[model samples]
Target: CHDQQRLEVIFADLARQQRSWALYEDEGVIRCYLEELLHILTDADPEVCKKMCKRNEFESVLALVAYYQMEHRASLRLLLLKCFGAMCSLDAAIISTLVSSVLPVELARDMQTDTQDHQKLCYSALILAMVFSMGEAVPYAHYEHLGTPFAQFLLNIVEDGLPEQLPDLCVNLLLALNLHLPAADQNVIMAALSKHANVKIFSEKLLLLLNRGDDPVRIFKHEPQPPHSVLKFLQDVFGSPATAAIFYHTDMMALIDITVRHIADLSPGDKLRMEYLSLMHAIVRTTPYLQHRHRLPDLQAILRRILNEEETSPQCQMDRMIVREMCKEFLVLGEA
Candidate 1:
């Protein structure tokens, strides 16, 4: 009966039709509906619609909101949120339960085996991925809706699969897990992060091209200094020995040195260009004051060279985008 009701009422209105969705001219109504779909059907509804819609079709729904500025559609993405002073048991809440009950856990399982790496080339998945990834950076209260199973999928790799093999996924998952860190787990994770050749090498080179005037996290409480200032801070607090131990002592000091040199090599604006520049900036800015760091340098020259060098390389472009977005969110705090 419920399935039939879903098909007859909800799907009937949204699916297979050409004209009905047009009734949602007000982005608000459409947004409400999409949030409703996220709440109620989850993967079950979308899974059922899979036969009719594109694989992972809800992505298009998001694209309609993002590119077309359909604010209502964007509103739907908040299906999991609890709003101010509103009835907690409203349809949105009901849909939340329904979506939880129907989330496609099996689909996520299948994705783990996707050796084919078939990219969802559509804007929907691309945009959804971008939005979902954004959650890992901010404090938990800022995006409570991210707790929903679908929005939380990419973050399962830390315990769900090989930690090191899925570096990008694992890094974000660690952020999403946001559990209070046990000393041992923190050690293991920080060590793993430091040892990764790609992260290590990129961080080292970025520090090298940075300039003196750059302040990667311009919104910092105190006046921003340089990446070495951060390392110095860390050493003063954590002690060079402790900092090295957490990072597997894998010559992090050397990497910091290299990064500083690179910073000095760039023009201020160019140095601040994203990618390596941003990553170093995040490291210095967000890294706890256990170490004595003051600032991160802008490395525009290094960044421009990297962009030009990677122009012919598709894989490089992918790597650069991943790192750029990671650092883009270096400074947000929780609302509470």
Candidate 2:
């Protein structure tokens, strides 16, 4: 409580002296203020964090820090990166503010630079990865703004594997990449998984992390879980007709088989199983015009049995509904 009250005082002081700080050449004072602000925003108390973020000057403070980087050195830039990186969990408005600035692009560039600043580069990559993963939270106007530069940034990580030092950080970055990258451009990544040895290694490790969760309840939490997230990413990519066209050209049927088998083997009434069946229903419904219709045969037998089975429990009804839909679509198509 004392710490939060002290930060409130500090923030007020910074606001009052914003103009004076332009003439303030004291690095210690500037760094101290920035560090304290970062600390308060990331405080353990959720309300403190929320109050700090909801302040009217929140955007101005961020813009001021960004402007500070113009006249300062890499030290201040690193501080700004850490500050905004912590703010990633705040809201899309603030994140969109960060995206409108050159901060993420600057971090991405540093990540690719061949300098010996390995620690900073890794930090930059982690921050950029988090920022990129905010796609769903951000408005389309802001999300679409991260078009090619962000895609290329992720592509560089996959190709070079420079900041692959931390396993957990690497998995987080990969999940962000999987969740946000467009279906049309995802084929490029899929190709890299086959051709680039480094890319293949990273993707393999990512699959292992995705499958690490074992507890059914934890995996089935109403909020997103890692395994469930992986399933959704696959469904999103495969559900798109554009992605189906790309899949037709790739020699990845065996990989697709492995993923489906992973999901198919889940307990009958598991939430993850329902998620898997949802994807199967989508595939069956879309297969009539899908470019990769030839792949339907492989999944038809499995879908048929799941669809035909009857279940009475309310908890299992969603999965049964999805299965019935899949069965109906197949019967209409003369594939059952």
**TM-score to true structure, per model:** 0.27, 0.64
Q: How would you encode candidate 1's per-residue C-alpha lDDT over 57-173 as one tens digit per residue? A: 443222222322222232332332221101112222222222232121212333444423433111222222222221112333322333333223343332243313343333333
Local accuracy by lDDT, each model: 0.34, 0.53
Give the worst 10-residue stretch by lDDT in candidate 2: 214-223
| Best prediction by lDDT | 2
lDDT of 2: 0.53
Question: Mind sharing the TM-score for model 2?
Answer: 0.64
Model 1: ten consecutive residues of lowest lDDT: 80-89
Each candidate's root-mean-square deviation in Å? 17.4, 6.2
Clashing pairs in 2: none
Q: Candidate 2's residue-wise lDDT over 1-336, tens digit each? A: 876676676555544423534335566776777787678667657566656665775645465444644534556556756776667665555555665566654555555453356666666667766565553333344333234444444545554655346444544554554554445344333333333334444445434544553321121112233344455554654565544333333324443455457556766666677766665555544334344554456566565655566766554777667666766656643264
